[model samples]
Target: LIDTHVHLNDEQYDDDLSEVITRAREAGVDRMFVVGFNKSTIERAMKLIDEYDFLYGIIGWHPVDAIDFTEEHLEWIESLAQHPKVIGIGEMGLDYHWDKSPADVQKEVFRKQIALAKRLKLPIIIHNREATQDCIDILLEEHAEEVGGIMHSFSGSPEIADIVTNKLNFYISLGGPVTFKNAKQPKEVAKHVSMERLLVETDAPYLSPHPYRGKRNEPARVTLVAEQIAELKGLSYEEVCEQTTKNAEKLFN
Candidate 1:
């Protein structure tokens, strides 16, 4: 299986990243995309992608850091996106929950990145949190369908997923939260999104799946995500794994 989203470049696994990668492979995770949401992590992501044969990188400035994102950086980002291992652009979108940067600024940054993705003919990876409606609105207004992307670790309703995916052509990725007993939205989403538009991720160093909840997440935990989605979608474990892996390959390839 391919884990479509992973922050394995984070310092959490700095001392033993090799072991973490091995663990993921042993756990049946065939490949992983190491995400870069900011400066240091982006640098780390580049280095790791160069070092590891099975790793891919998605680099962009996250929404929370929108204040520091500069025009010069946009040019810089566009330059590196041609790297063979840099599969796509972003993990960029609105994040009202943190309120680290002004919403308008975040919105502009998102727009710029979306424009960059379109110009570069790359898919985007959106990070929406407590700002789903606005994010969808922006994607629609900006004609985001021209360069479709993933709604990373989505936390919206099945209805919302339908709109973004059907209307905006965005793929929905479910992570650790889908495994939680009380996660109604994610469970419904697992069954809601078309199997072809669905993907699974770990969002490593963050949302670990059940039994490993609250612990540092890793790419290996994507198995749990696939298992949970399998149960929700009334499919077998291998079916979920194979289907989502194919979906990932189709999008990121």
Candidate 2:
């Protein structure tokens, strides 16, 4: 399976990075895209993708820290994206939950990144939280469909999923939340998105799946997320894995 998004660079796995990677491989996760949202994580992600053939990096600025972004940072991101291992250009979008960055700032940064992604002709990895309307608006305004991206770890409703996929050139990637017992939206989304537009991820060290929820998530647990998606879609585990992997490969390749 392909874990479409993860943060294996997070300090949480500093001590057992290899074992965690081994566990993911053993769990049948063949490829993982590690996202770096800032300076430190971007460096770490670059090193990781260089060190592991199965890993790839997606670097961008996070909305929460948008207030600190600058032209230099944009240039830095653009330069790093030139690396053959850097498959995409984001994890950039709106996040209203934390007021660390003003809405206007986040929107400007997101637009800049989207423009940058188009210039690079690379797919984007969007990170939206509690600012769906703004996120959709910016994506539309920027004509993000030109370089379609993934709605990383999406937790939106089935209707939102339709809009994201049908109205925009984006895919709905469900993560650990889809496995949660009470995650009505993601569960319904699992059944809503067409198989061609569906993908799976762990968003490791963040949204671990059920029975292991609230713990430090590893890519190995991505199977649980796939299992949940499979159940919701009335498909087999291997089928879910195969299709999600294929979808990811098509988008990120």
Candidate 3:
């Protein structure tokens, strides 16, 4: 299995990062795509990817902090694409829930990253929060379909998922939320999205699956996510793992 999006570089894992990686290996996770949303996390992600052979990275500025994105940061991210381990361009997209960055700022930053991804011919990793329509709009206007990408931790309706998967050429990634009893959209999405376009992630140390909900999440919990997705899709656990890992590899590799 491939943990398509996780923040192993976050401080939450600093104390026992090695143990967490071991647990993931034991859980059958073959590769992990670590995300670095901002400057510090991106730096840490670079270091972590170099340290672990099984780890790859997705680096970009976070939309919540889009107000701080600058030319220097853009250049830095572009330069990192030279590294073989840096597989994708972003977790960048609109996040209207936080007022830290205004809509205009987030939109501009999102567009910039999309442009960079397109220019670099790298897949993008989108992070949308309460701004799906605008996010879709930007992806459309920016012509992101050229490079294709993942809609990371998607919580949108199946209709939106259809548009994203078909129109934007993006994969729908479901994480811990799909395992939640009350997460209607993600569950519906898990059932509605086609197997080939579906991906799984942990998004740790953020959205931990069912029994571990509200606790610190790690890459190992991605198996629980795969189990939930398999049950929802009426497939075997091994099938879900193989298909999702293939989907992630097709997008990032």
Candidate 4:
């Protein structure tokens, strides 16, 4: 299985990242995408990717850090995409939940990064939280379909999934939230999105699946996500795993 989006580079795993990877392998997670959210994180992600054959990297600046963005940062991020293991560009997009940066600045940076991804012919990993309308609007206006991408940890309704899948050619990823008792939308989305256009992720070091909720998440927990989705879609766990894993390979490859 492939963990399509994970912050293994985050400080939360700094102490025992190697052991975490070992546990992931033991749990049958075959590959993982280590996401870089900023300048400093990209360096950490590169180090981890280099040390582990199973870990791939995706380097980009996140929108929450938009206020401090500069042209030099974009150049640096673009340069890292040259790495063979750097399969995509992102974990980048709008995040209004934190309100750390101004919306307009975030939008500008997001637009610039989308264009960069298109120019590089690389898929994008989008991070959208509480800014659904604006995020979808920018993606549509910028013609993000040109590069394609994944709406990582999608929290929008099934209708939003329809728009993203049909209009943007972007896959919708479901994570631990779908297993939550209150997560009606994610479950609906899991049922709504076509298997061909769906992907699964742990978003690890966060969104730990149920039975392990509130604990540190890892790629191993992705199986739980697959199981939940399987139950939602009336398919077997193996089927969900096979389909979503194949979808991840197709998109990230």
Off by over 4 Å in 4: none
User: What shift in Å separates residue 140 of candidate 2 from its native position after superposition?
Assistant: 0.6
lDDT of 4 by residue, 1-253 (tens): 6788888998888899888888878887888899998888999999889889988998888889988889999898888888899989998889997778899999999999999998889999999989999999999999999999899999899888999999899999988998998768888899888988888888888989899989999888887888888999999888887898889888877
lDDT of each prediction vs. the true structure?
A: 0.90, 0.91, 0.92, 0.89
Compared with the true structure, the alpha-carbon lDDT of candidate 2 equals 0.91
Cα displacement (angstroms), candidate 1, residue 112, comes to: 0.3
Question: Each prediction's TM-score against the native?
Answer: 0.98, 0.98, 0.99, 0.98
lDDT of 1 by residue, 1-253 (tens): 8999998888889798889999999999989998998878888899989999999999899999999899888988888898999998978999998878999999999999999998989899999989999999999999999988899999999889889888888788999999898868788888878888899998988989999988999889999999988888889999988888888888877
List, residue by residue over 1-253, the lDDT tens digit for candidate 3. Answer: 9999999999988899999999999989999999998999999999999999999999999999999999999999999978899999879999988899999999999999999998888999999999999999989988899999999999689999999988888899999999899668899999999999999899999989999998999999999999999999899999999999888878877
**113-208, model 2: which lDDT tens digit per residue?**
999999999999999999988898889989999999999888678788888998897998988888888758888888878999999888889988
Q: In model 2, what is the error at residue 165, expressed in angstroms?
A: 0.8
What total of clashing residue pairs does each candidate reach? 0, 0, 0, 0
* Runs in model 2 lying further than 4 Å from the true structure: none
TM-score: model 3 vs. ground truth: 0.99
How does model 1 score by TM-score? 0.98
Clashing pairs in 4: none
* Candidate 1 vs 4: which has more lDDT: 1
